[PDB]
Amino acid sequence: AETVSFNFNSFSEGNPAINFQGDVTVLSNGNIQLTNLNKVNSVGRVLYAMPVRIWSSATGNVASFLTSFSFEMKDIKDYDPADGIIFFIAPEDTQIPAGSIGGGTLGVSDTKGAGHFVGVEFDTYSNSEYNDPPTDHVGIDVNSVDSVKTVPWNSVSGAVVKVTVIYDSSTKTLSVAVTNDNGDITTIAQVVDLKAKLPERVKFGFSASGSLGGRQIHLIRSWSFTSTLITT
Amino acid sequence: AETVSFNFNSFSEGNPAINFQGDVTVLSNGNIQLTNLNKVNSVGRVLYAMPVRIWSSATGNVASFLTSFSFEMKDIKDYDPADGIIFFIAPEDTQIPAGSIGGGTLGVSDTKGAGHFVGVEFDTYSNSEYNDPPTDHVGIDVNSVDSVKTVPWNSVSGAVVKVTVIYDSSTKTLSVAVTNDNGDITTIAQVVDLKAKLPERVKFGFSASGSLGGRQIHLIRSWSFTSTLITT
Amino acid sequence: AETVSFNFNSFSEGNPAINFQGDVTVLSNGNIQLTNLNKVNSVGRVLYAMPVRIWSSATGNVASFLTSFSFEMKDIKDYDPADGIIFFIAPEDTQIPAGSIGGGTLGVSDTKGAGHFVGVEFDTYSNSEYNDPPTDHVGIDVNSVDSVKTVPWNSVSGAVVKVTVIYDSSTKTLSVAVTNDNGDITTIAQVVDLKAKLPERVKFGFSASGSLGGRQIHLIRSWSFTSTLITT
Amino acid sequence: AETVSFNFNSFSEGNPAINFQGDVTVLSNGNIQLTNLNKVNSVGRVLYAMPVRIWSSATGNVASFLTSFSFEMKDIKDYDPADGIIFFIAPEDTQIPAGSIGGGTLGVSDTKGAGHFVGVEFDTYSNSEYNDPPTDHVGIDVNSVDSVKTVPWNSVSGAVVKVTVIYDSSTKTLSVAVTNDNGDITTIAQVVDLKAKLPERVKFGFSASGSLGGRQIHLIRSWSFTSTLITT
Ligand SMILES: C#CCSC[C@H]1O[C@@H](S[C@@H]2O[C@H](CO)[C@H](O)[C@H](O)[C@H]2O)[C@H](O)[C@@H](O)[C@@H]1O
Ligand SMILES: C#CCSC[C@H]1O[C@@H](S[C@@H]2O[C@H](CO)[C@H](O)[C@H](O)[C@H]2O)[C@H](O)[C@@H](O)[C@@H]1O
Ligand SMILES: C#CCSC[C@H]1O[C@@H](S[C@@H]2O[C@H](CO)[C@H](O)[C@H](O)[C@H]2O)[C@H](O)[C@@H](O)[C@@H]1O
Ligand SMILES: [Ca+2]
Ligand SMILES: [Ca+2]
Ligand SMILES: [Ca+2]
Ligand SMILES: [Ca+2]
Ligand SMILES: [Mn+2]
Ligand SMILES: [Mn+2]
Ligand SMILES: [Mn+2]
Ligand SMILES: [Mn+2]
């Protein structure tokens, strides 16, 4: 079996294991700050530098995976706390969409909300143009920020949030468990055929965005991942 | 919302938060040892003492949950390393089945392998009477030790194993991720309608069993859990 | 170490974490209403269903605890705003005293004011029979509603009150901080040996009561708790 | 009654409500970073700019206070994780001691460990020169970093820690409750006569330090305080 495994308790801007895109900075505490609070339509993304083979064209086998991460979203004076963080999977050549308007796109899609990615979004603003639910929500995205499925959620300013994601290759189920600061758990699961929607080699990471009036602190505190693909 | 949450880094005898059934002891290091190595048809079970409201007859709402645990199985001289550990969910009045033969029953079912429980087993012996797969396996059980689904696995003697379980109430999906000592991840997921198979109030826990010639060390090292039920 | 931790932002009828005693109801907003406004000598109590091992006869170690809660007391037309709320600790088998006269007993003691409990009272009526101070007060109680110590306080009708309680096992100090509506804080601290006054296993809760003439709305809005016992 | 109350969910560089001393900075996320990882014997402190009248020469009354804060300590590559954070109270004119050697002096004392302050230290290095206990600890300090009392503790790298402090003026008791990442609570309480050790008006704040080989990240995430002094 072919396995990719890593653990990040902290992040350093110098390290080759991570690719930094757009307005991403690394704070002295080791946290990744995805958006620039003084920039209009700010977009920042982070990717694990090594491409992970999630399926085989030779065997037809799809990898399984377990991944855990922690993030923080914090309000800033005068600006609307927007637009959120997206944990995404995309082709290895992925870049911030050209002429990105940030905001509702979450740095992974065009103005119409279309892209080439599979993701778990932690959306803190209601964009009617992408048919967003009325409140804060966790969503399962397939090539669009117009979510396949959403679950009502609450983004608490300055709160540390824990996420656990299981992708079972046999049932093609993407399961998400989100642990809020008040102790409650929020789940969302969706059948997503990764072979049909993504290439053999993909990159995994995080993305966040803001606008002119919609800005907030987007932080990635830690990340652990382990994926296994059967080669027999 | 109604939430039940706990975290056990260690265990202690006399902790009113845990119900001890059968042959369970607590070691000096804080580990729970489920089976008695000197007893025939040894059965040991640990339950979280407080019943959990996994669904409401008034609203029709079902609870989602997230749990993590770590266990160890270790071989003993002369005896066949058997029979394994099962993480289970059952009605609050649950007891070791009367006249339990232990062994392949994993302490949750009768001689025919029938019971009233939903569980995730970590099976180290192949019982033909319960149509077990030929090698060690992780299985999803619904009122039977004749698993609804199995996945090939390997129980390494003296190895610490990490498990992560997500239940999404909306899709009724029970998802499992098992982190092996060789670094690989093993997953298994199954749609299980907890509202159709179990009463409103349930107990969560662990069970292990042995036979005359099939005995091993069954250890529960740690356990965290969080469940949320949306209320009217 | 052995830790018990819970958080209630709201309450619900049928939640197995809460034992309801006497005249307690749960309002639609999630608040617990401890007394029946149309009943004479009304007594209502709520207990955390799981017994907490506050000390061990095996090691001699005593647990430390941190708890926070919010309550509301509101005057009702024609009746004397009485009698108050008590946050208490008692043996796991605790029940409303048989033939309870309510009123000044605060639902935890007999007519003479004697009982088996340790508590923090928020007294709104001066009972000369229990040597109450002349004004509203916060009191620390040890097997009696004739307080070991009191501090002058003011119960404002319809005001939300925040309480923070720290018990340090090493110094045996029970410390209380009460945050009034107008922003002011009221404190009271007392050395209380829980190992000498209470059994190893207890229950934690709230109690309120009234008389024929003395009646008011007694509400428990939220409650958080964490206790740690060193298992050397 | 005379009450001082404030709440900081975040911090900002252009805020006249806070005095910044030494090597302290404000990160873009709003966190206060007390020490400079690139500086030898680094010292940084933050104070609430308004002096708080903790006792009256006119009435002889002493204030009671309730404060809550959250911090983070994180290890840095190659350097020994040191020296820790101290929550302190000192005369309004307080400055970093002249020619501060950083290290075990926690930025509040001279080389011999003497100063003019009352504090709660979260010590992560054992200094034999100040008779430190062998492991990480929480300590109650009175004009010395050679603690009046200590309690064993564990500083977990990258973990968010919550603290609750109650000072009861009548019993002169300073009570501390520390909530660790793993859920456990650590307490320490000590009788400290603030009227005898500190002047009428005082300043409250935080301090941290480092040395040549002993450095780590020291962060103050949030701070809430309320003091009430009876003026009758
Ligand atoms: C050759 C060959 C195969 S040996 C099979 C032996 O099975 C046991 S019971 C059996 O024990 C197993 C441990 O090995 C497991 O614990 C099973 O769950 C339990 O059902 C009988 O008692 C013996 O008579 C017999 O030899
Ligand atoms: C004169 C004079 C003073 S009025 C005192 C009255 O006390 C009540 S009981 C009393 O009621 C109080 C409410 O006011 C409180 O609830 C007390 O806890 C409870 O013990 C008697 O029944 C009456 O007969 C009597 O007049
Ligand atoms: C021998 C031996 C054991 S190593 C001790 C080293 O201590 C430092 S100072 C010391 O540094 C510590 C960090 O490790 C802490 O910051 C202390 O508060 C600070 O006082 C000296 O400069 C070195 O010469 C010496 O090697
Ligand atoms: Ca949106
Ligand atoms: Ca079997
Ligand atoms: Ca009274
Ligand atoms: Ca030190
Ligand atoms: Mn959305
Ligand atoms: Mn099986
Ligand atoms: Mn009283
Ligand atoms: Mn010290």
Short mmCIF file of C-alpha atoms in Angstrom, two decimals, chain C residues 43-45 83-86 88 100 102-109 121-124 127 130 141 145 206-209 218:
data_model
loop_
_atom_site.label_atom_id
_atom_site.label_comp_id
_atom_site.label_asym_id
_atom_site.label_seq_id
_atom_site.Cartn_x
_atom_site.Cartn_y
_atom_site.Cartn_z
CA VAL C 43 -39.78 23.53 46.61
CA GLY C 44 -37.89 22.77 43.37
CA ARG C 45 -34.46 21.17 42.91
CA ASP C 83 -37.17 32.92 49.37
CA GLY C 84 -34.07 32.56 47.17
CA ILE C 85 -31.80 30.06 45.42
CA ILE C 86 -29.10 27.79 46.91
CA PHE C 88 -25.58 22.98 46.85
CA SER C 100 -40.55 20.26 53.78
CA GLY C 102 -40.07 25.33 52.02
CA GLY C 103 -39.57 29.01 52.77
CA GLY C 104 -36.38 29.70 54.74
CA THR C 105 -35.24 26.03 54.51
CA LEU C 106 -34.34 26.85 50.80
CA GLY C 107 -35.50 23.24 50.08
CA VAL C 108 -32.33 21.66 51.57
CA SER C 109 -33.05 21.54 55.35
CA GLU C 121 -27.20 30.65 49.09
CA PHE C 122 -28.66 33.79 47.42
CA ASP C 123 -31.08 34.74 50.17
CA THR C 124 -33.82 37.37 49.51
CA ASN C 127 -35.57 34.57 58.58
CA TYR C 130 -32.15 30.91 61.07
CA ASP C 141 -23.76 27.05 54.37
CA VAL C 145 -29.32 27.46 56.52
CA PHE C 206 -29.70 24.05 42.67
CA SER C 207 -32.67 24.45 44.98
CA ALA C 208 -35.31 27.14 45.57
CA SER C 209 -38.43 27.43 47.73
CA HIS C 218 -36.51 31.45 40.51
#
